[model samples]
Target chain A: ARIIYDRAFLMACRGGGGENLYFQGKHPLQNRWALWFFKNDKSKTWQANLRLISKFDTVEDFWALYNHIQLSSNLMPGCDYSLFKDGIEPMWEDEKNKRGGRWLITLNKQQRRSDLNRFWLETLLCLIGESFDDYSDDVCGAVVNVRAKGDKIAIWTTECENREAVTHIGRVYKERLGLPPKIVIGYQSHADTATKSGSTTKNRFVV
Target chain B: ARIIYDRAFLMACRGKHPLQNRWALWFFKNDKSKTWQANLRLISKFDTVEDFWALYNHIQLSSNLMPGCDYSLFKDGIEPMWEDEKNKRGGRWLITLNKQQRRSDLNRFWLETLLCLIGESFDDYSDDVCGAVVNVRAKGDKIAIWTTECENREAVTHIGRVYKERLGLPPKIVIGYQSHADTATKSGSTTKNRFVV
Candidate 1:
């Protein structure tokens, strides 16, 4: 079952946009995606803390879901929001994600207020909009982590060894975010991060 | 002049339904790293519903804000302060929420307050409202709707009644209206409520 946040949005989602409205003009996306919310609970298992909010395959539903939820910056410390292609679990253990890696963007604590939402939204559009063209296949999902120290956003991709596709996706993502020429982003393998974790994991590629 | 934070938002404004009044959003961060005035920053102003949603959806929700922070949405010309000439004579209908309700009710209350102000939900008393404020605090959270006059009893009461109903508060929950003048003089102990609804 999907989560219903409020009465107004609930009405809009549950057939309020009648058959004529929904079937006539709603544009569909190439892939269906699910939004997951995570809140750390030391007492619970990892899977217990993760919640599947909803899945969408259309532009209208995407905006509806995005506008209804709290912004990434507004989430509590240790909370996260992950948007991944439907059926792909966000964990590193998933078969679809094990051999993959992620393009990590570390934001300063101050950026939580000024830049976090904008950057996160841009990353989401990059995925649903397929901004990477052929290299889009390498893109699996994205995660935004709100922490006490600082916030981090990473776009997970399949197969870190595919340097050509990985670097292209990195460059396109950097460009789409309008990051300065001087600001570089890096890609790290899931295997590496899972083994060493945190800052100890070295970058596999930089763009 | 309006503030333009994102290029895409600017482009969206080129074509969208315009709202009735231009509104300004002010963000207050409680950080010793800056001066008091510096801490109160004007984020943006918008005259269209699309722009309003763009900004609202872009920013953090009131409930998620740090203690001591505030989000104020006021008419473009009226400063969100007791001393603002347009606000000095006015008062606010304040709704205080307990700590336990912060997670369950804070955001809904704050968002509903914004909707009332922007949607002009007060009918005849709509113009009486100057703005609204949400203060995120450690002890409790507060959501207040500011009015243009404290002496206008009819308008003040009407605004209060409609606001309470729109927020879907139960009959047991009572909200008080306080003039800025009275609040300024008392400063925390508890200024007497000029009127309660």
Candidate 2:
């Protein structure tokens, strides 16, 4: 009786549904990633309001997580969606991020409706897809912010001072997005933004 | 004496950043000097995000690799061969890229493939997946994600469907899956496509 119960319990955890065909092979990912959510609450502190939604490393789980969440465009103003490599926090204060910077693209109100979804998808794909060629190592992750004034999407990389590597990412990213040649994107250091002393930090490199 | 080292190490600091699975990165440079095994060197084994990047940043891009070279990622404890017990009877989902797209799309596709492997992007069928391989050649390049058993239509179909979408390919663009048993018997142009999505 004890042996039979143990066997039955093991099958339930397999969760393949009585198909009897499900096996124990688990497709494991190389790196686990964490998804974080930030919704504006003026009354709450930034750290207090931030929440860890879930973490996933598999293809199926990623789509599962993505499908279940609200689209970036659907997010209310002051809301953000950040997917960072696991163990890395989604903030400038994170040691892994403090020295890094972002390649930012600003979209107008019209684009918020027309281009927001596509842009956000492309950004996420670029980050996870490791589309930056040799420079992919420089990438950290990505963030999409839904704002009332304008929408912002950025790909954060691991280094702010690594200009050659950072610029290579910018050039490839701009190309991958199929942006107009005339349209330029800029890379900004986290240090500058975190310690802002001016109206706006100067762009470190633009392409 | 060996036990003493183990005790000291365990007491001091065991420097292992455990990953879901310790993946082995193998680099195959087709050359005249060695057997396939001899030429295939274990470049590094990393399970953590930081280590993976450290290895990646040090290597050349797939596009830059010469023809006849290959890069394969497989779970640790598994050898990267179709004949390996772990890989035998397995089939692979293959995505072929055109020469023109190599400059623009190859990196993205390959990276996406890597991400899918490391991220376990496949849901219930994730176990079917074994590892992935990228073959860099002159005419065109090929990337394949291997599965332990391709006989299960349900698992293969789901993995294939999700892989194409993750790469953001058009619905009309289809990819093929071929079993190793057949692939070993047949060469490049003749292997039968058992499944497609």
Candidate 3:
């Protein structure tokens, strides 16, 4: 994805026409969010293979950009889509994310057709919404990894060992996904996942 | 600066903790004959918050950089090139400064841009941010905040708004975004803009 913000005529740029004629104000969002993409390349080191896509802080702009990109289900295996607070890297190493963990949701192969897109959309809404109550501070961002084995969608948090915050986030998140009580999702700290092989790290909180 | 990756290991290692992402700093000595990638050289990746400062305090100010030189700080594995697959579809939000502004604004703006990226100053879209680049040239200098999704209007605009504000640029000052593909295909003095602000 690319952007064309013309600074020279930034103020002069005109609109979608009719909508602007009756406009009151450009609706503002609470927090600016950025969308990231990862393409699997074997030759380069992991970081070299990464690049930036684009960013936006408004409701209308979000739709304009979202409507333009490939959906999560359409991405090739090993690809990833991340939505994070501006300035924070999606990796476990960013300062704000060092102590964080993520709530992991795995989908079965068959669900890729019937549920992948819907699940991702639902997950994104939860990441941006403030409905998590007091524990909202712990919510930093989310990711959807498209892997050959299966797809993984996770909501990365700001804290891992904080039992109260982590647990509350997991509970509300599971409920938001409308997951059946029998289906369980778990949160694992980055420290554990970083050292473990595969996604085999132990879970700190489960719902 | 060497960072202690784990706070738990702080006592055994350096006391300050490492950053969540391993970020490497790169310098570009522009050689017209070579491609931008060839000109780009990795300096070192910083592991901790203090390490970033260590490098910051020592580098030549933006005003002193030779024309065509650039400083880019990206996550450890990503290259500073448009051909990289991760950058293939992505675009950049850019601002160009004239010679007069170099001595007056270049250093401050460049520093602010770095502060924004490291401090997660962009708020909700920090994860969406890829990295930042400062290009020093004879006629002018340019700085940009890169993101992974160019088409995501919300993420792009949000980042642009915060980025401009963080630099403390006036509202009258405008900026633009360019897709790496579009820029890669540039033929002359002009390039296409995907989004404007």
TM-score of chain B of each: 0.86, 0.84, 0.83
Query: Candidate 3's residue-wise lDDT over B1-197, tens digit each?
Result: 11112222322332244354556787888688999667776676654566776677667532256786888877655666666666667888998988899999988888777766666665566666678898988888988887777788888888888788867778898788887778888589978888877
Residue-level lDDT of model 2, residues B1-197, one tens digit each, is 00111122222332233344446777787787778767766666655555665666667433356778898998765678988887898989988888987788877788778767665667767667788998988788989999998789999999999899888999899889999988888466668889978
Off by over 4 Å in 2: A1-30, A70-74, B1-197
lDDT of each residue in A1-207, candidate 1, tens digit only = 222122243224433353536466664677777787888774544644566667787666887788777443357888998998866768888767999999999899899898898899888888877777778878889999998788999999989999999999999899878999789898999988988554657899999
Ranking by TM-score: 3, 1, 2
For model 3, the docking class works out as incorrect
lDDT of 1 by residue, B30-99 (tens): 7898987767777776555666776777775432567889989998667788899889999999999999
Against the native complex, each candidate's DockQ, computed on alpha carbons, is 0.01, 0.01, 0.06
Per-model i-RMS: 17.8, 15.5, 6.5
Which lDDT tens digits does candidate 2 get at residues A1-207?
Answer: 111112223223332333323533433344567777788764544653555666775444555566667443356788888988876668877777889999999999899988888888667656555566657767778888899889999988888998888998898778867899999898999988677686877788999
- Return the TM-score for each candidate structure: 0.46, 0.46, 0.55
Best by TM-score: 3
How does model 3 score on DockQ? Answer: 0.06
Give the lowest summed-lDDT range of ten residues in model 3 chain A: A1-10
Model 3 / residue B66 / CA error / Å: 12
Candidate 3 global CA lDDT score:
0.72
TM-score of chain B of 2: 0.84
